[PDB]
Design an enzyme around this catalytic site. Structure first.
Site, PDB file in Angstrom:
ATOM      1  N   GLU A 217       0.733  -1.029   0.020  1.00 40.26           N
ATOM      2  CA  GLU A 217      -0.058   0.051   0.096  1.00 40.26           C
ATOM      3  C   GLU A 217       0.949   1.220  -0.056  1.00 40.26           C
ATOM      4  OE1 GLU A 217      -2.363  -0.958   3.466  1.00 40.26           O
ATOM      5  OE2 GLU A 217      -3.308  -2.527   2.491  1.00 40.26           O
TER       6      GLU A 217
ATOM      7  N   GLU B 119      -2.388  -7.776  -3.213  1.00 37.56           N
ATOM      8  CA  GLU B 119      -1.488  -6.542  -3.047  1.00 37.56           C
ATOM      9  C   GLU B 119      -0.101  -6.396  -3.400  1.00 37.56           C
ATOM     10  OE1 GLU B 119      -2.585  -4.165   0.545  1.00 37.56           O
ATOM     11  OE2 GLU B 119      -4.690  -4.845   0.399  1.00 37.56           O
TER      12      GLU B 119
ATOM     13  N   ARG C 283     -10.996  -8.673   0.648  1.00 39.63           N
ATOM     14  CA  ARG C 283     -11.803  -7.707   1.281  1.00 39.63           C
ATOM     15  C   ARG C 283     -12.033  -6.444   0.670  1.00 39.63           C
ATOM     16  NH1 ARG C 283      -6.273  -5.633   4.688  1.00 39.63           N
ATOM     17  NH2 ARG C 283      -5.398  -4.707   3.120  1.00 39.63           N
TER      18      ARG C 283
ATOM     19  N   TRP D  76      -8.577   2.735  16.179  1.00 33.05           N
ATOM     20  CA  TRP D  76      -8.109   2.581  15.089  1.00 33.05           C
ATOM     21  C   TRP D  76      -9.017   2.654  13.858  1.00 33.05           C
ATOM     22  CZ3 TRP D  76      -8.522  -0.793  19.326  1.00 33.05           C
ATOM     23  CH2 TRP D  76      -9.494  -1.874  19.246  1.00 33.05           C
TER      24      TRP D  76
ATOM     25  N   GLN E 292      -0.624   2.916  10.607  1.00 31.28           N
ATOM     26  CA  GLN E 292      -0.641   3.045   9.378  1.00 31.28           C
ATOM     27  C   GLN E 292      -1.798   3.128   8.496  1.00 31.28           C
ATOM     28  OE1 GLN E 292      -0.894   1.584   5.736  1.00 31.28           O
ATOM     29  NE2 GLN E 292      -2.126   0.076   6.553  1.00 31.28           N
TER      30      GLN E 292
ATOM     31  N   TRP F 141       6.124   0.645  25.203  1.00 30.93           N
ATOM     32  CA  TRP F 141       5.752  -0.811  25.470  1.00 30.93           C
ATOM     33  C   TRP F 141       7.288  -1.617  25.659  1.00 30.93           C
ATOM     34  CZ3 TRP F 141       1.873  -3.106  27.360  1.00 30.93           C
ATOM     35  CH2 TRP F 141       1.651  -4.638  27.151  1.00 30.93           C
TER      36      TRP F 141
ATOM     37  N   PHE G 186       1.438   3.993  23.175  1.00 33.77           N
ATOM     38  CA  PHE G 186       2.238   2.979  22.742  1.00 33.77           C
ATOM     39  C   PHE G 186       3.683   3.431  21.920  1.00 33.77           C
ATOM     40  CE2 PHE G 186       2.666  -0.682  19.092  1.00 33.77           C
ATOM     41  CZ  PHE G 186       3.148  -1.689  20.245  1.00 33.77           C
TER      42      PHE G 186
ATOM     43  N   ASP H 258      -3.291   4.326  25.689  1.00 37.66           N
ATOM     44  CA  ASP H 258      -4.220   2.825  25.911  1.00 37.66           C
ATOM     45  C   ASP H 258      -3.748   2.538  27.391  1.00 37.66           C
ATOM     46  OD1 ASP H 258      -1.424   1.995  24.855  1.00 37.66           O
ATOM     47  OD2 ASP H 258      -2.145   0.280  25.428  1.00 37.66           O
TER      48      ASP H 258
ATOM     49  N   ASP I 194      -3.355  -0.933  28.516  1.00 37.06           N
ATOM     50  CA  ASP I 194      -2.428  -1.862  28.640  1.00 37.06           C
ATOM     51  C   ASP I 194      -0.854  -0.975  28.700  1.00 37.06           C
ATOM     52  OD1 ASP I 194      -2.098  -4.149  28.692  1.00 37.06           O
ATOM     53  OD2 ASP I 194      -1.869  -4.629  26.457  1.00 37.06           O
ATOM     54  N   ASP I 195      -0.620  -0.162  27.961  1.00 34.61           N
ATOM     55  CA  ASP I 195       0.615   0.515  28.012  1.00 34.61           C
ATOM     56  C   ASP I 195       0.832   1.304  29.653  1.00 34.61           C
ATOM     57  OD1 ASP I 195       2.800   0.901  25.722  1.00 34.61           O
ATOM     58  OD2 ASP I 195       0.826   0.846  24.582  1.00 34.61           O
TER      59      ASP I 195
ATOM     60  N   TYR J 160      -8.649   1.652  24.623  1.00 38.98           N
ATOM     61  CA  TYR J 160      -8.536   3.124  24.618  1.00 38.98           C
ATOM     62  C   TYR J 160      -9.823   3.928  25.272  1.00 38.98           C
ATOM     63  CZ  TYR J 160      -4.996   1.980  21.283  1.00 38.98           C
ATOM     64  OH  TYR J 160      -3.846   1.428  20.810  1.00 38.98           O
TER      65      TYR J 160
ATOM     66  N   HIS K 175      -3.408  -7.275  33.323  1.00 39.49           N
ATOM     67  CA  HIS K 175      -2.293  -6.321  33.580  1.00 39.49           C
ATOM     68  C   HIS K 175      -2.524  -5.079  34.532  1.00 39.49           C
ATOM     69  CE1 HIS K 175      -0.716  -7.842  29.230  1.00 39.49           C
ATOM     70  NE2 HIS K 175      -0.335  -8.544  30.192  1.00 39.49           N
TER      71      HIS K 175
ATOM     72  N   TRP L 123      -4.369  -9.302  22.837  1.00 38.82           N
ATOM     73  CA  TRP L 123      -3.345  -8.639  22.345  1.00 38.82           C
ATOM     74  C   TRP L 123      -1.896  -9.812  21.915  1.00 38.82           C
ATOM     75  CZ3 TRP L 123      -4.720  -4.665  19.573  1.00 38.82           C
ATOM     76  CH2 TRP L 123      -5.976  -3.980  20.228  1.00 38.82           C
TER      77      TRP L 123
ATOM     78  N   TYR M 250      -0.839 -16.779  26.463  1.00 44.40           N
ATOM     79  CA  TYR M 250      -0.787 -15.388  26.650  1.00 44.40           C
ATOM     80  C   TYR M 250      -1.577 -14.969  27.739  1.00 44.40           C
ATOM     81  CZ  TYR M 250      -0.328 -10.298  26.189  1.00 44.40           C
ATOM     82  OH  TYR M 250      -0.348  -8.860  26.277  1.00 44.40           O
TER      83      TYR M 250
ATOM     84  N   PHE N  56      -5.298  -8.051  15.182  1.00 39.11           N
ATOM     85  CA  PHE N  56      -6.987  -8.111  15.262  1.00 39.11           C
ATOM     86  C   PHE N  56      -6.813  -9.918  15.185  1.00 39.11           C
ATOM     87  CE2 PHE N  56      -7.380  -4.143  12.632  1.00 39.11           C
ATOM     88  CZ  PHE N  56      -7.262  -3.500  13.994  1.00 39.11           C
TER      89      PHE N  56
ATOM     90  N   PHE O  41      -4.925  -9.953  11.569  1.00 36.11           N
ATOM     91  CA  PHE O  41      -3.981  -9.338  11.672  1.00 36.11           C
ATOM     92  C   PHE O  41      -2.983  -9.596  12.673  1.00 36.11           C
ATOM     93  CE2 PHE O  41      -1.990  -5.788   9.437  1.00 36.11           C
ATOM     94  CZ  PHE O  41      -0.938  -5.367  10.173  1.00 36.11           C
TER      95      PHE O  41
ATOM     96  N   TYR P 142       6.692  -8.730  17.833  1.00 38.66           N
ATOM     97  CA  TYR P 142       7.076  -8.059  18.623  1.00 38.66           C
ATOM     98  C   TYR P 142       8.753  -8.562  18.917  1.00 38.66           C
ATOM     99  CZ  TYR P 142       2.692  -5.981  20.298  1.00 38.66           C
ATOM    100  OH  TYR P 142       1.420  -5.122  20.515  1.00 38.66           O
TER     101      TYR P 142
HETATM  102  C1  LIG Z   1      -3.911  -2.897  11.224  1.00 41.62           C
HETATM  103  C2  LIG Z   1      -2.424  -2.159  11.544  1.00 41.62           C
HETATM  104  C3  LIG Z   1      -2.615  -1.134  12.669  1.00 41.62           C
HETATM  105  C4  LIG Z   1      -1.909  -1.847  13.679  1.00 41.62           C
HETATM  106  C5  LIG Z   1      -2.946  -2.422  14.884  1.00 41.62           C
HETATM  107  C6  LIG Z   1      -2.255  -1.461  15.950  1.00 41.62           C
HETATM  108  C7  LIG Z   1      -1.146  -2.008  16.836  1.00 41.62           C
HETATM  109  C8  LIG Z   1      -1.105  -1.346  17.976  1.00 41.62           C
HETATM  110  C9  LIG Z   1      -1.759  -1.816  19.086  1.00 41.62           C
HETATM  111  C10 LIG Z   1      -1.669  -1.079  20.558  1.00 41.62           C
HETATM  112  C11 LIG Z   1      -1.951  -2.239  21.439  1.00 41.62           C
HETATM  113  C12 LIG Z   1      -0.644  -2.845  22.038  1.00 41.62           C
HETATM  114  N1  LIG Z   1      -0.732  -3.215  23.457  1.00 41.62           N
HETATM  115  C13 LIG Z   1       0.219  -4.038  23.786  1.00 41.62           C
HETATM  116  C14 LIG Z   1      -0.111  -2.266  24.493  1.00 41.62           C
HETATM  117  O1  LIG Z   1      -1.995  -3.567  23.737  1.00 41.62           O
END
Ligand SMILES: CCCCCCCCCCCC[N+](C)(C)[O-]
Length: 619
Positions: A36, A84, A118, A160, A253, A303, A356, A365, A367-368, A411, A442, A480, A486, A592, A596, A600
């Site tokens: 992309e 793609e 998709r 997102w 992105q 993170w 993050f 977020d 989690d962070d 979030y 956490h 996650w 996990y 996801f 997705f 890490y």
């Molecule tokens: C579809 C691509 C977009 C990236 C997906 C988002 C990744 C960032 C995720 C933030 C959550 C991370 N965590 C460990 C702190 O939970």
């Protein structure tokens, strides 16, 4: 035994740290990022031939023997991803004749052609004029007019998805076309006898939206549309107000890419936001040693840094270690002190979260934050005035973010709306940000580190949530991180941290599940397939990170003396490299569920170190 393993592990983490005092391993995803990107550059009319080459190399280095690309290493071929990659490659110079191209094409045609991809892939292709705009679900800029309590309003979507929608509504409102040169056209993606197997919404589609979409496309062709330009500006403003310091949008992105396209359409290439947005892209790019280039779906400095500290402290290092001090100082400066989109649900809640990436002030977020606050709590910094203060601010922020059911989301508070998961457009990933087990786990351990137990009503409600969410087999879903291993590891260690009696029936059931999944080699594995097929639950090749998670589950459950635990440590000790680190050719990261995945880079190093450190102290 593990002693030398620890020392080497520790000296290895210390070598990976930056001078500013933070850790930042690259985030691995898949080929669509750069495919992309290639496309993006075409539209923007800013193609760097040199860059294209490094991308051409990478795409190829990633394609498997069968001529396809997956979402994760070792995974089944993905149509969307392959389609793609195929197009990017063709735009670069590859002719349909060449081996890599041919094998890919075959797969693409056997899957039903372009019509089986998709919405996104079809849309990206539409943008470049290779697919009719009319066959792509419409997202009107008028969605900007829906109010806070009204259904389908933007604040009912997860972070997102939210920015992505706003940015896309402007793009779809104009249906632009940036024709590929005759040499890069791909009509061959249509040549198929196989009937196109269409994928619906994330949870079934209603015929209403189906009808609605057609109506929208008809409205699109009318000579006039009142208040349209008004909604566009609403959307534009929304984006202008929410741009991140690094120039990105949400530090991820998708919305970033679409936002750039949106500004191009509106002749705003000479506008500050566009400029910063465009130049900010470089920071996310990565030069590969083999001569390749990759783009990061997102970046995890905060993170990584958070975990590294926890790992290193559990390893045995003192709170006042000059290096950890460098880290705690850095972390403090990263604290967000202004309202974000979460404030829409909590206007009186004083900000104090953590994000993050490096600079993403509107989207912290839990989690962070939970990790960072906790991590800060272990350290002993010079100005404990700012340390105590920061912790206090973060702590109260987390508490205020708790959702109705007693658990925490990533979030937003109660982003549990069901409506958005039915729209035609939403056929890829999560669209809402509801509470999850791991994040809650956490957050819980965070509080625990401060001394709060089950007595506190906040924590009590949280536990009730977890108990109700526990799977039949006594395992916990990993949202996650890559699944059950996990999830379970996260939850169990948390329950122990909040003064819960591990002797409990449901907690013991969890520990049993863990032992019953150990691999012959004495490690623990879990393939990403555990999201699609339930037979893969806690089943996969052993990995350092996953082994370590399961190991924590045992140590927290009082089973450090177990046989299972002994082989677990041995695994790590044996599979460790001479430099101190561990390898891991698999993804234990989840963006996801089912759509997705993430790599890490640091997990393979940090977790074993944390897991091992916890074992030594368990003696
Ligand atoms: C579809 C691509 C977009 C990236 C997906 C988002 C990744 C960032 C995720 C933030 C959550 C991370 N965590 C460990 C702190 O939970």
């Amino acid at each position: 035994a593990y002693a030398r393993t620890l020392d080497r592990a520790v000296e290895y983490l210390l070598s990976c740290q930056k001078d500013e005092g933070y850790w930042w391993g690259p985030l691995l995803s898949n080929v669509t990022m750069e495919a992309e990107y290639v496309l993006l550059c075409h539209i923007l009319d800013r193609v760097d031939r040199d860059r294209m080459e490094k991308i051409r190399r990478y795409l190829l280095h990633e394609q498997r023997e069968d001529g396809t690309w997956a979402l994760y290493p070792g995974g089944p071929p993905d149509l969307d991803t392959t389609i793609e990659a195929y197009v990017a490659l063709k735009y670069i110079g590859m002719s349909r004749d060449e081996e890599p191209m041919q094998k890919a094409l075959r797969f693409i045609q056997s899957q039903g052609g372009i019509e089986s991809s998709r919405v996104f892939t079809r849309m990206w292709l539409a943008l470049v004029g290779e697919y009719p705009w009319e066959k792509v679900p419409m997202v009107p800029p008028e969605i900007m007019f829906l109010g806070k309590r009204m259904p389908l309003n933007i604040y009912e979507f997860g972070s997102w998805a939210r920015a992505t929608v706003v940015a896309l509504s402007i793009v779809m409102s104009r249906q632009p076309v940036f024709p590929l040169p005759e040499r890069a056209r791909v009509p061959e993606l249509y040549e198929t006898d196989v009937p196109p197997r269409r994928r619906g919404a994330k949870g079934g589609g209603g015929w209403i939206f189906d009808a609605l979409d057609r109506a929208l496309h008809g409205y699109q062709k009318l000579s006039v549309h009142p208040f349209r330009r008004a909604a566009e500006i609403r959307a534009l403003d929304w984006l202008l107000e929410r741009q991140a310091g690094d120039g990105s949008w949400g530090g991820i992105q998708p919305p970033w890419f679409y936002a750039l396209i949106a500004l191009k359409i509106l002749d705003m290439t000479q506008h500050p936001a566009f400029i910063k947005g465009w130049e900010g892209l470089e920071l996310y790019g990565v030069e590969l040693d083999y001569g390749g280039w990759m783009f990061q779906a997102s970046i995890s400095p905060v993170w990584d840094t958070g975990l590294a500290v926890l790992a290193l402290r559990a390893a045995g290092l003192p709170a006042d270690h000059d290096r950890l001090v460098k880290a705690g100082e850095w972390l403090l400066d990263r604290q967000i002190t202004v309202p974000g989109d979460w404030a829409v649900k909590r206007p009186n809640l004083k900000p104090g979260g953590f994000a993050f990436q490096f600079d993403n002030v509107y989207y912290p977020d839990v989690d962070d934050t939970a990790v960072v606050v906790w991590a800060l709590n272990t350290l002993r910094l010079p100005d404990e005035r700012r340390r105590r203060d920061a912790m206090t601010k973060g702590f109260r922020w987390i508490v205020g973010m708790q959702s109705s059911n007693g658990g925490w989301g990533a979030y937003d508070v109660d982003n549990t709306s069901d409506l958005p998961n039915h729209i035609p457009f939403c056929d890829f990933g999560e669209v809402t940000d509801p509470p999850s087990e791991d994040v809650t786990a956490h957050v819980l351990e965070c509080f625990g580190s401060f001394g709060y137990d089950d007595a506190w009503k906040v924590i009590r409600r949280a536990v009730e949530y977890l108990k109700r969410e526990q799977k039949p087999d006594g395992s916990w879903f990993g949202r996650w991180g890559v699944n059950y291993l996990y999830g379970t590891g996260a939850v169990v260690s948390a329950l122990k941290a909040v003064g819960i009696d591990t002797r409990e029936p449901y907690i013991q059931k969890a520990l049993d599940w863990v032992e019953q999944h150990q691999n012959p080699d004495g490690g623990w594995g879990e393939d990403c397939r555990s999201y699609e097929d339930p037979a893969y639950a806690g089943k996969g090749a052993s990995t350092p990170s996953q082994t370590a998670w399961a190991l924590m589950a045992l140590i927290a459950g009082g089973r450090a003396e177990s046989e299972a635990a002994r082989r677990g440590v041995q695994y790590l000790v044996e599979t460790q490299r001479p430099d101190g680190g561990w390898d891991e050719p698999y993804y234990t990261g989840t963006g996801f569920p089912g759509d997705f995945y993430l790599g890490y880079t640091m997990y393979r190093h940090v977790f074993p170190t944390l897991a091992l450190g916890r074992y030594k102290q368990a003696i």
